[PDB]
Design an enzyme around this catalytic site. Sequence first.
Site, PDB file in Angstrom:
ATOM      1  N   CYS A   1     -26.651   2.802 -35.752  1.00  0.00           N
ATOM      2  CA  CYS A   1     -26.555   3.893 -34.254  1.00  0.00           C
ATOM      3  C   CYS A   1     -25.062   3.812 -34.097  1.00  0.00           C
ATOM      4  CB  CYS A   1     -27.111   2.832 -33.167  1.00  0.00           C
ATOM      5  SG  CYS A   1     -29.220   2.929 -33.343  1.00  0.00           S
TER       6      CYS A   1
ATOM      7  N   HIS B   1     -32.662   9.257 -28.839  1.00  0.00           N
ATOM      8  CA  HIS B   1     -31.727   8.658 -29.742  1.00  0.00           C
ATOM      9  C   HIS B   1     -31.870   8.998 -31.081  1.00  0.00           C
ATOM     10  CE1 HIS B   1     -28.912   5.416 -30.849  1.00  0.00           C
ATOM     11  NE2 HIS B   1     -29.821   4.520 -30.675  1.00  0.00           N
TER      12      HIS B   1
ATOM     13  N   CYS C   1     -24.669  -0.185 -29.159  1.00  0.00           N
ATOM     14  CA  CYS C   1     -25.217  -1.293 -29.804  1.00  0.00           C
ATOM     15  C   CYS C   1     -25.668  -0.977 -31.294  1.00  0.00           C
ATOM     16  CB  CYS C   1     -26.225  -2.282 -29.119  1.00  0.00           C
ATOM     17  SG  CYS C   1     -27.958  -1.026 -28.955  1.00  0.00           S
TER      18      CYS C   1
ATOM     19  N   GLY D   1     -28.025  -2.072 -35.306  1.00  0.00           N
ATOM     20  CA  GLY D   1     -28.834  -2.822 -35.670  1.00  0.00           C
ATOM     21  C   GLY D   1     -28.274  -3.496 -36.780  1.00  0.00           C
TER      22      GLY D   1
END
Lengths: 390, 390, 390, 390
Positions: D87, D346, D376, D378
Amino acid sequence: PSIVIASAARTAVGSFNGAFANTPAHELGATVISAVLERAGVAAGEVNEVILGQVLPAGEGQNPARQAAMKAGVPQEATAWGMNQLCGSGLRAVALGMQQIATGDASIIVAGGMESMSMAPHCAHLRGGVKMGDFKMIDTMIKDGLTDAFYGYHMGTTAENVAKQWQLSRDEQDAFAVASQNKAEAAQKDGRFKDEIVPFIVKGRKGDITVDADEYIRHGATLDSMAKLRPAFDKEGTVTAGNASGLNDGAAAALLMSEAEASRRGIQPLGRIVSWATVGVDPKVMGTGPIPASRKALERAGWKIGDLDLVEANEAFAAQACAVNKDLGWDPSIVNVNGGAIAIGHPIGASGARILNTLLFEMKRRGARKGLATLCIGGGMGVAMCIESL
Amino acid sequence: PSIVIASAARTAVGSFNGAFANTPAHELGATVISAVLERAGVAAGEVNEVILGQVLPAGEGQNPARQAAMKAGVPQEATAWGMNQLCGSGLRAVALGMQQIATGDASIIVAGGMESMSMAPHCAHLRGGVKMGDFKMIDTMIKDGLTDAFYGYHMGTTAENVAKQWQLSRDEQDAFAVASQNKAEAAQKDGRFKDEIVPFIVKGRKGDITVDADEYIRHGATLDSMAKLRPAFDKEGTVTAGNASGLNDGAAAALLMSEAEASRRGIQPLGRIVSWATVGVDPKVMGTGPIPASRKALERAGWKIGDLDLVEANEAFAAQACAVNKDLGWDPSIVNVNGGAIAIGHPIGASGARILNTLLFEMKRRGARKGLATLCIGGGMGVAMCIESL
Amino acid sequence: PSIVIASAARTAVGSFNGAFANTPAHELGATVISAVLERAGVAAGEVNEVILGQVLPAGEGQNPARQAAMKAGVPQEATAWGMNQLCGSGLRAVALGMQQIATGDASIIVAGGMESMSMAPHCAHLRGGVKMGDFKMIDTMIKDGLTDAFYGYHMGTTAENVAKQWQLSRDEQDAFAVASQNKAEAAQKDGRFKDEIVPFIVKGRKGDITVDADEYIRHGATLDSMAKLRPAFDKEGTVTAGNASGLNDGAAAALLMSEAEASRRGIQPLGRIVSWATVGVDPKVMGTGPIPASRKALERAGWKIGDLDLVEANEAFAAQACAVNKDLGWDPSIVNVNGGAIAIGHPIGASGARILNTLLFEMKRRGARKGLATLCIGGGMGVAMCIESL
Amino acid sequence: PSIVIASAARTAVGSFNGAFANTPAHELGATVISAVLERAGVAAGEVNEVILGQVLPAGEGQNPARQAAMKAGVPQEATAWGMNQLCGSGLRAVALGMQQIATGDASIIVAGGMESMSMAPHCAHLRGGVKMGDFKMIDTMIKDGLTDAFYGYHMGTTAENVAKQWQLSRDEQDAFAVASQNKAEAAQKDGRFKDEIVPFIVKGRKGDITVDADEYIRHGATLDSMAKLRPAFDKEGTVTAGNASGLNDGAAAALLMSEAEASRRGIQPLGRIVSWATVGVDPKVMGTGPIPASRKALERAGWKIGDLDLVEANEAFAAQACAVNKDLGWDPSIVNVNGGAIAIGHPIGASGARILNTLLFEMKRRGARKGLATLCIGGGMGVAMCIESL
């Protein structure tokens, strides 16, 4: 030996990925098995054997004839199998069940077909594994259902050969098409399809949906919209989506016994199997199948073509159907009186017992005595059955 | 009507992903159709129909019965169809061919089965799409061929069902497996398979290979290699790879005509068919179907169990093989005389016509006058057929 | 800023579906990260980021660079990421790592690449569903790794394009290929790959296997064996499986820090990164990428071509490697002195760091002061890096 | 060195298998490259490199960033590459682009990301082969995008981990979610996304469709509708489809150059890049990444948290967005003033550039001097960037 059809039943014919899109073929069969039983007044426990025509059973698990009979309350002690003569399968299984009783191997049979073209999967031979390079996932519907195994083209290409060879115009194919739709629309609105259609319940998470109508019949089908369409197979051809049959789901069957057994049990048969025949033909023009088959049939029964009062001659394509009726010379006003497959659907395995239903109930519904069925079959065949009322 | 197998031939059973790893079913069937017409001295143009059992046709193209028949040189004239009573298909095909002639629907048939378990593909239904998440590609050989559709477990778990109900221990099933293998390794070396095998030419690129031997007969099967195999279905069970038959390819068939036509043509038949049957049993214990099927057919023939000179009871599993031998009680020494499927292979659709071949040639070899074949079938059935020699 | 390579390491290069056939790329990556740390006397807790070129990560899970770092014991507080400039990746990652230190964002970077062409999967977009018709399972290795996205043909065709443009004969190409094999064989035998290779343990079931030799290098490669191959991309072409590189698995990396930091720690670095560059070319002649990239790197360093003591020019295909050498005019005797990718293999995302390792350990061995590493890149690019000994 | 963002653009964010269901990510990328160029008054011939974050490129062909560059008219002499920090990608790319300029390797960079989650395929490793049995076709979107590689569970489970750790109620998460929707609805209606969005033309057989509106934003979202949803990851959880972000398609980018070069060209830039940072955390609570990444970015800039005028903190899940805001303590009224990812969507590799676009255009409109963007990541990471107006 003398065998009758005591009763008959079919689901409605669903449209490709439509009402029955996710419904296994044996589900549609199990209802149709229970319906012929309930119609003749015969209990499930009395069935010696269940025969079901089915062309595309990949992934449905072990012997979907047995799944259909078992779901329908037929006991474990009876038998069940499926068979495959393609578009001929559903009517052939009825001839096969007729033979079962003639030989003194069974008294009461459920015979017909069932197809779920929707649920047919894609497949690939993968055991060796693919070291490198793309590979094909094969649509079994196309590969095993609609493609000629010798010439490598669709069934629609065999219809072109036939159209070219009988000199049927693009206008003539569309006029027979618009006619077939019109006769089906008039019949459905007339409740001519009620008697034969047994309603099927599609079970859902947010709603059960009761399906008791043919969803493939196009309402208000005109000559202008027909003539606008493109040739689907041949780039300078004539056969189209409009004047050809479609991809469809359904099931249909007939409970068979000896004539005297029907009488015993106080049943009032829809017809008597006087004869049947299957014959082979050149694969390139498989659509002419129905000519030699219907003539073998008719010879076997001892009838001239002019004795028939009503005919179902399957409409695989507008090209072949027209050529069959041109050859055989029967009055077109007794052919496909409640429309044809171009309007109603072509659920391959089910198709032969689907028209057996339409003819039996219409033989009932106009007091006809004699009546034939016939269908062209891929790879170069035809099949037919002669039926005489009681 | 009295019906006689004028001739009978079969391919060698091939191992799974072995000699016929990339040979489609209909190529093997096509060898088998030629070899029956060659041995009887009857031409292919004389054949009315080809009826071939086949459980796993996904991917093979339209109606592979018709493909095998056209590659044999049986003309476009004749018809051809496939059919599915799972492991029973090959023999049922024979009973059906016999039926076509008994009702005067034809003159000459070629009935049997074919199977390429090797060529069976993976598949999944993907028309709806898979909007998100992992999905399963299904091995059709297991889903459609070997997995019970009701309880959802493999046929090797139905053999645990029967192994518990007849208290058949691990040392009894390892005895029947070694001794089937020993009987099978004795017959192959002594030539007793020769006549019934037509060789098949596996056409390649860098070397044509001729197969004509059951390659799945392991040579020198000891009891000590049998007892060290782990359970293959139940984790603490009795059914291993050793006391079960495998996955295999092959084809097997028979020429049928009236007795008065074979008598006519100067053909000394392999044998007359005197009866047949098929009966359903509880699907959990599907291997007990030959018991009812053998009893029904023995009554239709008018024979007693003691009258039989030779017997093929297909060995689907060592459990269910010792279960039929115990109930029916026929002399163990006259049964599966040249070994059986545990040792030879289990080509599902063709397995029925495989053991029937072995019976009819070993009936001609030792001078047996009476012979019954029989088989258990998934979903819970059996089939039997009685043969007397002329 | 002055950035040095404190240490480097690589795995052996695995043959396609060979030693590393079932080894995920991040396992190879983890071993090389461990190795660079050990070799430099730097602890994993000291690493700020890991940067790993990787072209074919599908099915490997979230961000395989992070997986590699974590498996090597690099702490959760560090970061990691992957990148893709096709064959340029493993070298570009090193330049990107240099830039993290130059801009004051990190002190200690592990950079390079990793690839498992073996473990690359087949795929298809299936969300919409496939309403009807065949579809391809796409080999991601071919589609995402080796096919030009503009012209649709394989990299091998771009090689033919360059063969025609530079008039390079099949004989010149085969000679170059055999020379590569013979140089690599000689280097392997003499132990020249030992310093650079870190052994990789392939964990099995019935035994671990330690791989520490390049398995793709063919020993005793003959001109004859090269001459007898058929063109692999163009049926009247010159590019063959023999004079092209192969499909391979491996990983390779470098540990970077400032020159002042290595001095503080007492590390004798493998080299100072003096300059780098990347430039585009026409995709149809992508093998020419090294030409502008090398010239740009040399201009940035303030070096003439004649100042180079050793060169690693990657051998994607003999045609392009010969074109590069002809255009640049550097002494062939200092290019690929231990052979090249035709012999050793071409693990796409790792290759640029594989050839950096070879250049670094050779420059150390021979006391070469100035070196350059360069590669061509699919879709029309080049990358180059200038290294000076300290 | 001082680098500015001269211009920025994004596509609308598409719903999963919505507007962009069949649009490859590089087509969206190409439109955004053309847009930043147009908006800055810079010609494609002046671009040195294009850098595009992208997590799910499987099946799209060689190096989709290049494909996007080439389609937009960026010359073959430029270069392009993709990268993957999950992300964080589309924000990380901008930092990487900044560094190419600071180290003097490029003058003009186009940087951001692109993603078609819709077009991500299913895959399976098939080279070894499946001797027999079922195997899994893996959704690459779930496997490579949304599943933690260490713990094996979905990102939504990491959100539950944070919810438990910060004691965040279902009601608090739902309130946050409804606020995000209501803020985005208001901004959309008022025209606040028009400046940032470049319209995208989806080409169709029967109609091109222009998409210029974020289609995922729910109009009139109610607290009651949110409250009725079932937990999507834990049966006794709090995280639902409602209070999580969605699965989306889009692209987004920035054109970068030096502050002095913008001044030469007369460009009023959107912002100066003052600092950036990336830091790791435990993968089990990856949603907390923004905390140390933001603090580190602020330290690097010499800013206090209170110095910020506007913040875009990406909303992967309500639980983690709430935790970040509670820890940092910035005024919630200046965070995601136009709504966030719960409402907007997203598109994983594009998201960091999507929020930068939203930050920049809002800073411009309200005259805010200091801004921060953070996401944030992953696997346990955060990335943040500090921007100051000129």
